[PDB]
Amino acid sequence: AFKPPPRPDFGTSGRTIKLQANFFEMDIPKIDIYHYELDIKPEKCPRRVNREIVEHMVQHFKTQIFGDRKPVFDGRKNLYTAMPLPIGRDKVELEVTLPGEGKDRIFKVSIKWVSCVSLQALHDALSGRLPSVPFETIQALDVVMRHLPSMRYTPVGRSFFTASEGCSNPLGGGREVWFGFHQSVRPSLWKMMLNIDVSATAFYKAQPVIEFVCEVLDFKSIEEQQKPLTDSQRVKFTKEIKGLKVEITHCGQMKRKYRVCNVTRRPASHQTFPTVAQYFKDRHKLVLRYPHLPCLQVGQELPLEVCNIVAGQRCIKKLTDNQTSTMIRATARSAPDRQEEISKLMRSADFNTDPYVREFGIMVKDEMTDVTGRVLQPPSILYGGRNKAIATPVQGVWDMRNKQFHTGIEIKVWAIACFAPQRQCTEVHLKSFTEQLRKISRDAGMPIQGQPCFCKYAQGADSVEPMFRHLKNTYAGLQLVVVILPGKTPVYAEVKRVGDTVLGMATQCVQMKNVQRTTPQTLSNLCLKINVKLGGVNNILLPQGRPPVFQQPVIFLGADVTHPPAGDGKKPSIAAVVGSMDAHPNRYCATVRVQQHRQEIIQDLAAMVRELLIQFYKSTRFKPTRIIFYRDGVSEGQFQQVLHHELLAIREACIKLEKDYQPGITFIVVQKRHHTRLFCTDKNERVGKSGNIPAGTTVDTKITHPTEFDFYLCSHAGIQGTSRPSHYHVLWDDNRFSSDELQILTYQLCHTYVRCTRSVSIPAPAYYAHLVAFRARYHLVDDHQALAKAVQVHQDTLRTMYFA
RNA sequence: UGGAGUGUGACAAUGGUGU
RNA sequence: GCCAGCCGCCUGAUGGCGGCGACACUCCA
Ligand SMILES: [Ba+2]
Ligand SMILES: [Ba+2]
């Protein structure tokens, strides 16, 4: 096994900044708690009614089994007590009746002593005496902290939602925003923390289906529809209730929870039922109030006044762009807004009154955790030309105005293939676009010497490969093909398949709307991409400002795996790995593979890293003495696996390059998907309307691991909403990095992303790896080895950053 | 397909089981 | 334990081919 190195030091670089984090300190006793296992018969029940069963079991066998003890329940098979039960260590069988009268099911439950979970061991791990934190104890504490919320609120994953209080938040036809919160127990130095963040989703309004139709079909009242429903109205009302659940209410106090299927075009009166309207006057004595609305077909092969909408449905449906817009009005709050909302939620949830967390002697603080962060100094960015301009990122941003590329490509043979309609993308557009692009190019030190040698329209994907062939054969020295497109078109994937994998020709696509009208910003970022695609070097980190790691040859790797949505039989997951090819580091080379459907481990990593090392040795004439590996998208539970496989893969790739070649490996996992938020304590340190922490804000205390080498770094400037600081976890480090050195290196690498002049949220290696997987997915658009070949890039473009 | 960011979306950590 | 969801297009759900590895919003010289 490979265990991650401990935190080497605590880091002191940068200017300090006071922060608050959405972690609330917990007070955890040092006594042991007791874990029992449950099995409820039958097992054809939702998780909610298993919780009701267990609650009635605790209330019924109070004097026999439990007593004053108030246990907690996972929902499936895990019960926990703060005191041992009198049942001993052997299984016990109990009979639990379920109340309701209209339906009374009998359940056979079995309680069995499993284990004695030690909170003292948890405290030992929180101090660092024990190196690794017990996951099972963390799970027990979690179950304890979400026992009551799982029953008083609506559970959705690790979040809980409710219907506000009074004034709802109307969304659209039959929906409304529910506000909720994610909750999770996390370990940290000396103390457990309760991590709380706010969230929202969409639920169906618990209204009678009449109101449903009124809001779906825009009726001031139901008396509006004094005629039968029209063609488009039936299908409209169908697409909104095709699978929802309704409650038949023509019954007494007794209710129903029958699901829904389709909608008829027969208004009850005119539907032969071997009519329906007739059926409701004789079977039950209920004259229909609206015998002109349609019926709700059920299941697979009823009036709208008899049905209601079953409260609590989560609306798994997709939302209208206007419901998405109102959702973002409600959810993407400024950082102070979200801070205040989390604090208010924690002040109202009253965890220090939950009888179950108090049964276990736990207390939760009401205030966010104070964290002393550090704003790291941003690197200076060296540009080119007679000026040799230096750019200083200011709040994570700089501009290329009055600056020229470090090394700018002279473009002197290029073509234009316009797959947009000539009627819409006229020749005046092409002329003025060329003029403006050339002006911006010359301004940036990437001059385009003369008009395009070739400039023609075309249509259809079938035209792509022939044309390019012609272009490659009839125009010598062809550097670039600009491909104007009319929007999302199958022509794009074909352009990339031909230019990247078949012929090895560099292409730059551009949307019609950016040729008809140009702006300096769009043309400039496009020039960035064009330059690096022709081998340019837009800029480099100021050489002297870099950490000491650059005093010897070093290669930086970025790796990512993209998966398809669940359900696809094969749709192989795409693994991409990129590697730096110079000391700057600016140029990166890519490798990609298809592998088992939804597998996170990069199976063929050894071969890919071998390719990258070979290219590095060829380009620099030296072998790296250090390998810095940035690995994206790995969960805690996958650490052991991925580390064991991929560390060994890298070592193999090394020794396959040379017998005794053992460079030091730094394996770092990059994670953006978490629920950690950081807020400025001083209103003066807030940046740009959103009110976020400054770019470069770093945290490696109070919410990080108690013993291991992890840290939050927010390297980007937040625009709208609350910034998501990237989290970094060092799974392996032969090179004995200091906290400061590694944090600074990560930050500086975040300024080497060629596609834009701003510090981005993750290091350029990782971002490039994502881009490479994206392009690979595009290359598969038209057998396993067939796919593996289709995703193989031509040898001439492999030399370039075609994925920019 | 100029580009970055953050909201929703991952049904492994979830959810169904009288016309 | 058995089961898996949503949206399109065609035959007009008795099937078949595609998406949800995205959409949305904010913001740049
Ligand atoms: Ba089950
Ligand atoms: Ba990933």
Author numbering: 22 to 295, 307 to 333, 339 to 819, 838 to 859
What text appears in the publication on this structure?
Mammalian Argonaute (Ago) proteins use ~22 nt short RNA guides to target partially complementary sites generally found in the 3’ UTRs of mRNAs, recruiting additional factors that promote post-transcriptional gene silencing through translational repression and induction of mRNA decay. miRNAs form a complex regulatory network, modulating diverse pathways in metazoan biology. For hepatitis C virus (HCV), binding of liver-abundant miR-122 stabilizes the viral RNA and regulates viral translation. The interaction between the HCV genome and the liver-abundant miRNA miR-122 was the first direct viral RNA-host miRNA interaction to be discovered and is the best-studied to date. Here, we investigate the structural basis for these activities, taking into consideration that miRNAs function in complex with Argonaute (Ago) proteins.
We crystallized recombinant Ago2 loaded with miR-122 in complex with a synthetic oligonucleotide corresponding to a variation of nt 1-29 of genotype 1 HCV. The 3.0 Å resolution crystal structure of the Ago2:miR-122:HCV RNA complex reveals a structured motif in the viral RNA that exploits a previously unrecognized nucleotide-binding pocket within a conserved region of Ago2. Ago2, with its four globular domains (N-terminal, PAZ, MID and PIWI, with N and PAZ connected by linker L1, and PAZ and MID connected by linker L2) is found in a wide-open conformation cradling the viral RNA, with SL1 prominently extending from between the PAZ and PIWI domains. As in previous Ago2-miRNA-target structures, miR-122 threads through the central cleft of Ago2, with the 5’ end bound to the MID domain and the 3’ end bound to the PAZ domain. The viral RNA and miR-122 thus form a three-way junction, with the HCV-paired seed region, SL1, and HCV-paired supplementary region intersecting in the center of Ago2, cradled within a structure termed the central gate. Intriguingly, the viral nucleotide opposite miR-122 nucleotide 9 (target 9, t9; viral nucleotide G21), positioned between the seed region and SL1, is flipped out from the seed-paired duplex and bound in a previously unrecognized nucleotide-binding pocket on the surface of Ago2. The HCV 5’ end is pinned against a loop in the Ago2 N-terminal domain (residues E64, K65, and C66). SL1 is wedged between the Ago2 PAZ and PIWI domains, holding open the central gate, a structure in Ago2 that discourages pairing to nucleotides in the miRNA central region (guide (g) nucleotides g9–g12). The t9/G21 purine nucleobase inserts between P601 and the aliphatic portion of R814. The motif locks Ago2 in a widened conformation, which counteracts the propensity of Ago2 for lateral diffusion on target RNAs, leading to robust protection of the viral RNA 5’ end from enzymatic attack.
